[PDB]
Enzyme design. Structure first.
Site, PDB file in Angstrom:
ATOM      1  N   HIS A 107      30.280  -1.805  34.914  1.00  0.00           N
ATOM      2  CA  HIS A 107      30.381  -3.113  33.991  1.00  0.00           C
ATOM      3  C   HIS A 107      31.534  -4.156  34.718  1.00  0.00           C
ATOM      4  O   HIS A 107      31.644  -5.138  34.214  1.00  0.00           O
ATOM      5  CB  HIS A 107      30.785  -2.989  32.550  1.00  0.00           C
ATOM      6  CG  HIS A 107      32.253  -2.325  32.408  1.00  0.00           C
ATOM      7  ND1 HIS A 107      33.262  -2.678  32.683  1.00  0.00           N
ATOM      8  CD2 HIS A 107      32.474  -1.088  31.796  1.00  0.00           C
ATOM      9  CE1 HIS A 107      34.538  -2.030  32.373  1.00  0.00           C
ATOM     10  NE2 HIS A 107      33.909  -0.937  31.768  1.00  0.00           N
ATOM     11  N   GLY A 155      42.810  -3.639  31.307  1.00  0.00           N
ATOM     12  CA  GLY A 155      42.796  -3.318  32.612  1.00  0.00           C
ATOM     13  C   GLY A 155      42.844  -2.007  33.209  1.00  0.00           C
ATOM     14  O   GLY A 155      42.833  -1.621  34.144  1.00  0.00           O
ATOM     15  N   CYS A 201      40.013   0.385  32.909  1.00  0.00           N
ATOM     16  CA  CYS A 201      38.894   0.913  33.224  1.00  0.00           C
ATOM     17  C   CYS A 201      38.902   1.395  34.488  1.00  0.00           C
ATOM     18  O   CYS A 201      39.779   0.791  35.218  1.00  0.00           O
ATOM     19  CB  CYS A 201      37.830  -0.241  32.850  1.00  0.00           C
ATOM     20  SG  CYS A 201      37.762  -0.724  31.294  1.00  0.00           S
TER      21      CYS A 201
END
Ligand SMILES: O=C(c1cc(=O)[nH]c(=O)[nH]1)N1CCC(c2ccc(Cl)c(Cl)c2)CC1
Ligand SMILES: O=C(c1cc(=O)[nH]c(=O)[nH]1)N1CCC(c2ccc(Cl)c(Cl)c2)CC1
Lengths: 306, 306
Positions: free
Chosen positions: B41, B143, B145
């Site tokens: 993503h 932030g 991920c």
């Protein structure tokens, strides 16, 4: 969101851990530049532990009595000296993995990360606080002496603790890296007792702010109190008294949540007097005191390290 | 002695973390040999998040749309592909700090360490368990991920988790490193709900054995029970049922303490029915289920890593 007992990343410290052997005693040392630091009781034997005379014991040793291993590589010891309760072994090779570091002495109520080591090999990392009675509630087995505690500020490792011993009650005592004990303890195998512990109030309030940030609000109320009215109740429950410096330290968390410190104190006063009634806060059924205001900010607003 | 929430030393993982940027979206990637792994993503924009067609979005990208930074060094992307929910970016330089590693998928009830990262920089390490409903109760801010979860077996890092998203209830969901989600979740910003969670019974029993090893014995009794009588009470309290494989797994802890598993189950049955009466076990007022039998053995008998 979420809230965990979070330790500092340990990589910068892992590369400084070595194994130190003297006789049939082996423990961990900290290798920075060309010096290896370790507890001086590595030079004791069974006969010495009860009443060691470290000056005598050290003069009877030479450099070749000390085996230092960094993994496979043997480090040649070319000098030794004693600084208070730590031994400093000068070695022929400077550690190429030496980080930017400093030696700091922390205060009761402050937290740090512990890298638990055995035979010079890192085994685990966890967070703990220095208790008001100058012990830590650690997790250490035989062979763990010389494991270190540390904080990381930006790119700089601040070493604050070197592990020396376990007290009869199962708590742990050690020194700063200049070899000075935290608390009234000595490095001999006599039975020593820690003083009575108290709860670190400013840390409990920081943790309640973390709870609010994460959506646990059930304990709030609209009462307020004064510093002096709060401190009267706190002392009844073995809580450290709260100072104006503590109030100022909590400012950023007061700002972020819109709940004044003295408002939060009124909630704490209530929790101390009526308990939590089987409700939980951040997954705990007890008031947690091993997160500082800075720990909460770091975890609930986000700061990394280089 | 002592007992702490202990994470694995993170050094071997810290050197694999990099920053990945695509457009105005930045997150963390895992750099092993000449491949960088990150959540797919990263290629979404605000318009795409609700119903992304990842095949469409990826064909419209070229290698130069992906900025990969390892600290200062820029890594040149020379290829990209999608494997389920993870993006694999082939880069021109193999990571010289690549450890021995494997990709494993863990089961509910197992624990692992999380290295929380922001902008490719490690921020903290903590231990968590995979819940029966395939979420983890983590601590993650914007932030985070691409942060990874891992275990260390001897010298080998087993990567088991890559972080993708936070669910509305504040718990976290992600994939294994082959890109397959844990649980029935998808990487789109729809509202998704986790199933009901249960308590991991074999882990609670392991933790009670750790308590006995550390001198907390107040909850023991001389009753015994059977697997089937225990499981009838367990299901009433939302506890996972106990199998004969679980009993066998606890063997070493039964051996070390001299308390048979079914004896310990009788103590647990009692604790579930009458509560803990304001007493604590290993410093907790709730039954803890995020330590496996292997975690307890490692901490209460001592094993290091290379
Ligand atoms: O390694 C551990 C250990 C640490 C721990 O925290 N828990 C645990 O079970 N064991 N040792 C016990 C203390 C020993 C000692 C020997 C000589 C002196 Cl003079 C002193 Cl002060 C201490 C060295 C060996
Ligand atoms: O970094 C975080 C984050 C993680 C966390 O755990 N907690 C928190 O507060 N923030 N983001 C929120 C999820 C975002 C997203 C964007 C697009 C898709 Cl398709 C998906 Cl599935 C997720 C990426 C940014």
């Amino acid at each position: 969101s979420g809230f965990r007992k979070m330790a500092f990343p340990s990589g910068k410290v892992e590369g400084c851990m070595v194994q130190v052997t003297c006789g049939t005693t082996t423990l961990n040392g900290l290798w920075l530049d060309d010096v290896v630091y370790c507890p001086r009781h590595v030079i004791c034997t069974s006969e010495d532990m009860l009443n060691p005379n470290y000056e005598d014991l050290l003069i009877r040793k030479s450099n070749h009595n000390f085996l230092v291993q960094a993994g496979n590589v043997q480090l040649r010891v070319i000098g030794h000296s004693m600084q208070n309760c730590v031994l400093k072994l000068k070695v022929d090779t400077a550690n190429p993995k030496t980080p930017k570091y400093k030696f700091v002495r922390i205060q009761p109520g402050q937290t740090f990360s512990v890298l638990a080591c055995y035979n010079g090999s890192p085994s685990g990392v966890y967070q703990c606080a220095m208790r008001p009675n100058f012990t830590i509630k650690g997790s250490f087995l035989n062979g763990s002496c010389g494991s270190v505690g540390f904080n990381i500020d930006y790119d700089c490792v601040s070493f604050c603790y070197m592990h020396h011993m376990e007290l009869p009650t199962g708590v742990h005592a050690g020194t700063d890296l200049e070899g000075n004990f935290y608390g009234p303890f000595v490095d001999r195998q006599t039975a020593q007792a820690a003083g009575t512990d108290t709860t670190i109030t400013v840390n409990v309030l920081a943790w309640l702010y973390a709870a609010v940030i994460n959506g646990d609000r059930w304990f709030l109320n609209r009462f307020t109190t004064t510093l002096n009215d709060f401190n009267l109740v706190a002392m009844k429950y073995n809580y450290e008294p709260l100072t104006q410096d503590h109030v100022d330290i909590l400012g950023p968390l007061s700002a972020q949540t819109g709940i004044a410190v003295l408002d939060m104190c009124a909630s704490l006063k209530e929790l101390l007097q009526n308990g939590m009634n089987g409700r939980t806060i951040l997954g705990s059924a007890l008031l947690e005191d091993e997160f500082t205001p800075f720990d909460v900010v770091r975890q609930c607003s986000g700061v990394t390290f280089q």
